[PDB]
Design a protein around this motif. Sequence first.
Motif, PDB file in Angstrom:
ATOM      1  N   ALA A   1      23.270  36.384-131.621  1.00 47.29           N
ATOM      2  CA  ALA A   1      22.397  35.809-132.640  1.00 47.29           C
ATOM      3  C   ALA A   1      21.443  34.770-132.053  1.00 47.29           C
ATOM      4  N   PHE A   2      21.379  33.586-132.656  1.00 45.82           N
ATOM      5  CA  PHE A   2      20.411  32.582-132.220  1.00 45.82           C
ATOM      6  C   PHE A   2      20.906  31.742-131.042  1.00 45.82           C
ATOM      7  N   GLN A   3      20.182  31.825-129.933  1.00 45.65           N
ATOM      8  CA  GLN A   3      20.493  31.151-128.671  1.00 45.65           C
ATOM      9  C   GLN A   3      21.108  29.761-128.795  1.00 45.65           C
ATOM     10  N   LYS A   4      20.523  28.907-129.634  1.00 45.41           N
ATOM     11  CA  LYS A   4      21.017  27.524-129.764  1.00 45.41           C
ATOM     12  C   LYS A   4      22.023  27.350-130.910  1.00 45.41           C
ATOM     13  N   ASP A   5      22.340  28.456-131.566  1.00 45.31           N
ATOM     14  CA  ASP A   5      23.567  28.534-132.334  1.00 45.31           C
ATOM     15  C   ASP A   5      24.620  28.962-131.318  1.00 45.31           C
ATOM     16  N   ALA A   6      25.269  30.091-131.575  1.00 44.57           N
ATOM     17  CA  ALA A   6      26.296  30.619-130.686  1.00 44.57           C
ATOM     18  C   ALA A   6      27.484  29.675-130.598  1.00 44.57           C
TER      19      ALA A   6
ATOM     20  N   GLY B 144      24.100  43.131-141.428  1.00 54.78           N
ATOM     21  CA  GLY B 144      24.129  43.581-140.046  1.00 54.78           C
ATOM     22  C   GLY B 144      22.894  43.156-139.291  1.00 54.78           C
ATOM     23  N   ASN B 145      23.021  42.971-137.980  1.00 50.97           N
ATOM     24  CA  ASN B 145      21.930  42.446-137.161  1.00 50.97           C
ATOM     25  C   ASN B 145      20.634  43.213-137.322  1.00 50.97           C
TER      26      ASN B 145
END
Lengths: 269, 169
Positions: A1-6, B144-145
């Motif tokens: 998903a979002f790089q700075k989420d994760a 879903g993505n």
Amino acid sequence: AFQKDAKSSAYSSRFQTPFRRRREGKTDYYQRKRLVTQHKAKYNTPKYRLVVRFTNKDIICQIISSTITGDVVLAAAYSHELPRYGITHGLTNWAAAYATGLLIARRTLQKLGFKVFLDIGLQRTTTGARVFGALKGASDGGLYVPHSENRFPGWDFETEEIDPELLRSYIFGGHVSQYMEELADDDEERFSELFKGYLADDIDADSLEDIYTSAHEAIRADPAFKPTEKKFTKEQYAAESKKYRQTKLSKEERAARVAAKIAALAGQQ
Amino acid sequence: QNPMRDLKIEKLVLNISVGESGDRLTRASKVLEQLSGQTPVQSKARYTVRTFGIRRNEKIAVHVTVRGPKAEEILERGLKVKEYQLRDRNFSATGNFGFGIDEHIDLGIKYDPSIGIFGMDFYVVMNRPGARVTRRKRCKGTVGNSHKTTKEDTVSWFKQKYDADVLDK
């Protein structure tokens, strides 16, 4: 998903997963606790819930009780049985809920020669909801199902009063016919789209009440539950199903896949 | 693929900030009503500010959310005002977008001097079919993505139908 989420190691490591039946959004454990747990001094006396559940267009009524190994079905009726009793259309409506509920009561109460509590599940309690239709049918059917009147349609809000002329009308599909009437001279574009099958089997409105009226008779007359005939065995259903279920791997196969990968992706193309 | 993963608008939410309660707010409200037909909703100040002259729980802003057809009208209608030119920001990484217009008259709507002029915030949240999975009561899921609305995907959507221009880098 979002790089700075994760998610950190640390997030995952200390995460406490909720149950599963909760992760599934399927079980309200708080309400289940209180539905199931029995008075400690009535010992092994099972506490039977009447479970009513609506799928996208099949109604489910099981009488269920509990066991630390799993719950336990006493009786089950599905609104999809209703063709058996002369009901073919609108079988997720308030009247199919009533009918199915009456089928549940009559069926179990038969194989018994009975007190039971409504498991609404996650349904909202709105007045006129059809979960409560199930309830009426199981109650008019013979069960002792403790309940009040203020969620049946035709409950006057601004007075402690039930109009039962209305609630009768629901048991029999009266709101469905009345729509079906009303659509017969203000719009037949739609009346042919929905209400299609009623044309296709020549059942116009006025009759709707009789279908259900005699679905009732038919039910009390023979509730004893016909299982489907089957056609193909346990084994076949199994076999044809394994044609479509991928099967895991050996560490050995995975080992090659990496070694193979370091052959490719690595040693300078 | 694509069938059934179209790109409806979930909802349009017009919003009016007004650093005060009283007439000037009930007038902002009046605007949003007659413009939506829906009776609009008031928002209280979250804390007190002073340099903004507001107190906790003051009633400081109205807004209204509008869905289906009616949404598209007011969208386009105010989208006009903006000469069909947004900007490359304006769109969220999660694929929604918005703009402001001041002067709520630049899109139908007379003047009436006992009403005044107001600026509006336009904010358009987009989705595809099956948004319900993330929103119903039972078996609540996340979408879903390869189904999620994105910036790329929504901009391209905007650039198309509407024909409008994106702008900036």
